[PDB]
Structure 1
């Protein structure tokens, strides 16, 4: 299913059908994406299970050769990094950087805390390591100088923001999708009715709360206006 069906079954269950309503679809797109990450972390962090194929998003990345700090010679070897910032993956799935083919290539996405001591084994010196820096870009690393010829990679993980990874989405075979609401929502259908009920209960209470309607240079909420 798409974003459009999930927005408009939260809205049509709340009956926010009027154009002049206080809670827009932009309230829901925020509250669906945050309650998705809340719902995935409560099911899949207690013990390890299978994540289905549906909670994941594949984003395409373009890499550029960047130095360690600047153009100085005694500062270290250079890296690769994505041109754009990368969404923060959740730590409950199988993140995977693959060279636009899922069933091929060994590019290993690791933690940022491990990557500063990596590749020192002699049988691990041709492997391309990944992590998302504090800057927000996915950095690439090897002891092999062949790795600096990568131009395009993809990235399949459980990202925190469903909205962030929908904008960096891989281009389809027909073409790129213009609207956000026409892209597939990354959650299993077995979690959609717990997801709808939480967002609706979040916004059913505030839906009938009084508004500061009077323009009197005065707070009118203590009088239930």
Structure 2
């Protein structure tokens, strides 16, 4: 299913057909992305299960050589980093940075705490490491000067915000998809009934809840206006 089919099921389950309604598809897009990572963390964080291929998204990145701090000589070796910020991955699956071929390359996504201590082993010095700094950017690191020639990687993981990873999505064979709504929503099809139930339950009560109808310089909600 796409983004559109999941929006329009929750809208039709709530019967939110009218254009002059309080809850828009943007209330539904927000809650579907929030309840996706809520529900994936409820299933896949206590004990370790197989994660289906549906929960992952592959985003495309452009890498640029950035300094360590500034343009000074004694600061340390420079990194590569994504020019745009990357989404935050969930810690439930197999995140994987790969050089535009999933079946090839050893670029290792790790913790940010680990990446300040990497490559001191003599047998692990030609391996490129990845982490997301608190800048919001994906940084790259190895002791091999060759890693500073990467121009492009793809990042397959279960990101926390599914909407962020759909705007950074890889180009198709046909071309880019202009609307978020014609893009694939990233959840297993076995988790879509629990996802629709929780988003409908959150908006069902507030759907029939009263509003401050009158423009009279007064709060009319205690009167159930």
Specify the TM-score bucket, using the shorter chain as the normaliser.
Answer: over 0.9
Instruction: Provide the rounded CA distance (Å) in 2 between the counterparts of 1:20 and 1:3.
Output: 22
**Aligned equivalents of 2:147, 2:90: Cα separation in 1:** 26
Aligned to 1:21: 21
Q: CA deviation at 1:5?
A: 0.2
Q: Distance in 1 between matches of 2:140 and 2:215?
A: 56
**Structure 1: gaps (5+ residues):** none
CA shift at 1:24, angstroms? Answer: 0.2
Q: Secondary structure of 2:140's partner? A: strand
Cα distance in 1, alignment partners of residues 210 and 21 from structure 2 = 13
Give every structure 1 segment of 4 or more consecutive aligned residues whose post-TM-superposition deviation is greater than 6 Å.
none
How far does the alpha carbon of each residue in 1:155-209 deviate from its partner, in whole angstroms, 9 at most, with x for none? 0000000000000000000000000000000000000000000000000000000
2:48 is matched with: 48
Shift of 1:105: 0.3
How many residue pairs were aligned? 225
Q: CA deviation at 1:3?
A: 0.4
Alignment partner of 1:114: what SS? Answer: helix
TM-score computed with the length of structure 2 as normaliser: 1.00
Q: CA deviation at 1:124?
A: 0.1
Unaligned runs of 5+ in 2: none
C-alpha separation between the residues in 1 aligned to 2:152 and 2:85? 15
Equivalent residue of 1:153, what SS? strand
For 2:172 and 2:161, how far apart are their aligned partners in 1? 20
Local SS of the residue matching 1:12: helix
Deviation at 1:106, TM superposition (A): 0.3
Tell me, in whole angstroms, the C-alpha distance in 1 between the residues paired with 2:80 and 2:58: 20
**What is the alpha-carbon distance in structure 1 between the residues aligned to residue 131 and residue 117 of structure 2?**
13
